Amino acid sequence: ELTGLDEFALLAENAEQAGVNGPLPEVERVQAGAISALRWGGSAPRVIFLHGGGQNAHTWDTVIVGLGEPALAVDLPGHGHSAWREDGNYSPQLNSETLAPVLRELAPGAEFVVGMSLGGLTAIRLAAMAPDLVGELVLVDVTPSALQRHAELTAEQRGTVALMHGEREFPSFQAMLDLTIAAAPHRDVKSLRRGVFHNSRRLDNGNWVWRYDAIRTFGDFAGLWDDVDALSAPITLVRGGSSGFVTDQDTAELHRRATHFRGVHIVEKSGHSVQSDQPRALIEIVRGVLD
């Protein structure tokens, strides 16, 4: 497989996973400085989408194709086509500081922000610092406490990796796909293959690398809870029913601290990446929030 395939070549697969038919929406890549994004359905996005750690904007393709709304799907710093940082600082607080002037230019009229994991917390920091923009937050399988717990578990393996030389280097596409199959073997390989395609690039060596910087570190969660207390945007939470990432105690804590918690939707047979495992169920919920 030699691949100069355009990044929009597989969208018919996304339309089929979403269970929709008809012409594909218009989409193009946009950039303002350090931030790259996919702009869907023209120049007036209704919804902003923020992916998770180790993901990129393309994670949202199926959800965005199924929802049929104009949307902006942003590459977080360190991810997709967005610039890396030497300090490896992809904290919600920093992501939010980079993203806010770009969202003011590229999505000033988008009331709704959907964020998964790191993207969910980035959304909270955005809602805090720039309220005039965020009318409504949807969090996908994340709370501040839930991500703090995940950061603390991986701290030793993010200390060790950091001491290695270069990024990693992969002999083939298949070798990166093999790693993704290992982490989610029950998931349709054509879905997994599409995800790897977007998340990887071939070097002139003929070798392959991930598009994302290996995350050295995350941000100040007490400050992030202070942002949840001050926020006026209503918060909906979406959990994966097979995800242990967010506990019942996590959800109650978010209800207690939020000004307007709209509740948790628990999506049966979804892991952490609800947009990857059950996009049709995520489209219904997001459509519900647009009323």
94 touches Cl ion by CB under 5 A: no
- DSSP secondary structure of the chain: ------TTTTHHHHHHHHT--SSPPPEEEEEETTEEEEEESSS--SEEEE--TT--GGGGHHHHHHH-S-EEEE--TTSTTSPP-TT-B--HHHHHHHHHHHHHHH-TT--EEEEETHHHHHHHHHHHH-TTT-SEEEEES--HHHHHHHHHHHHHHHHHHTTSSSS--BS-HHHHHHHHHHHSTTS-HHHHHHHHHHHEEE-TTS-EEESSPP--B---HHHHHHHHHH--S-EEEEEETT--SS-HHHHHHHHHH-SSEEEEEEETT--S-HHHH-HHHHHHHHHHHT-
- Span of 44-52, 75-83, 244-252, 256-264 interacting with Cl ion by CB under 5 A: 44-52
279 touches Cl ion by CB under 5 A: no
- Tell me whether residue 52 or residue 70 sits nearer to Cl ion (CB atom): 52
- Tell me whether residue 40 or residue 218 sits nearer to Cl ion (CB atom): 218
- Span of 5-13, 43-51, 112-120, 159-167 interacting with Cl ion by CB under 5 A: 112-120
Among 45, 53, 120, 144, which residue sits at the site for Cl ion (rule: CB under 5 A)? 53
Among 15, 48, 118, 146, which residue sits at the site for Cl ion (rule: CB under 5 A)? 118
Q: Known catalytic residue: 79?
A: no
Instruction: Find the shortest distance in angstroms from Cβ 147 to Cl ion.
Output: 6
Among 45, 52, 219, 279, which residue sits at the site for Cl ion (rule: CB under 5 A)? 52
- Tell me whether residue 18 or residue 196 sits nearer to Cl ion (CB atom): 196
- Span of 15-23, 75-83, 116-124, 222-230 interacting with Cl ion by CB under 5 A: 116-124
Instruction: Find the shortest distance in angstroms from Cβ 117 to Cl ion.
Output: 3
Q: Which of 91, 96, 117, 191 is catalytic?
A: 117
**Binding stretches for Cl ion (CB under 5 A):** 52-53, 117-118
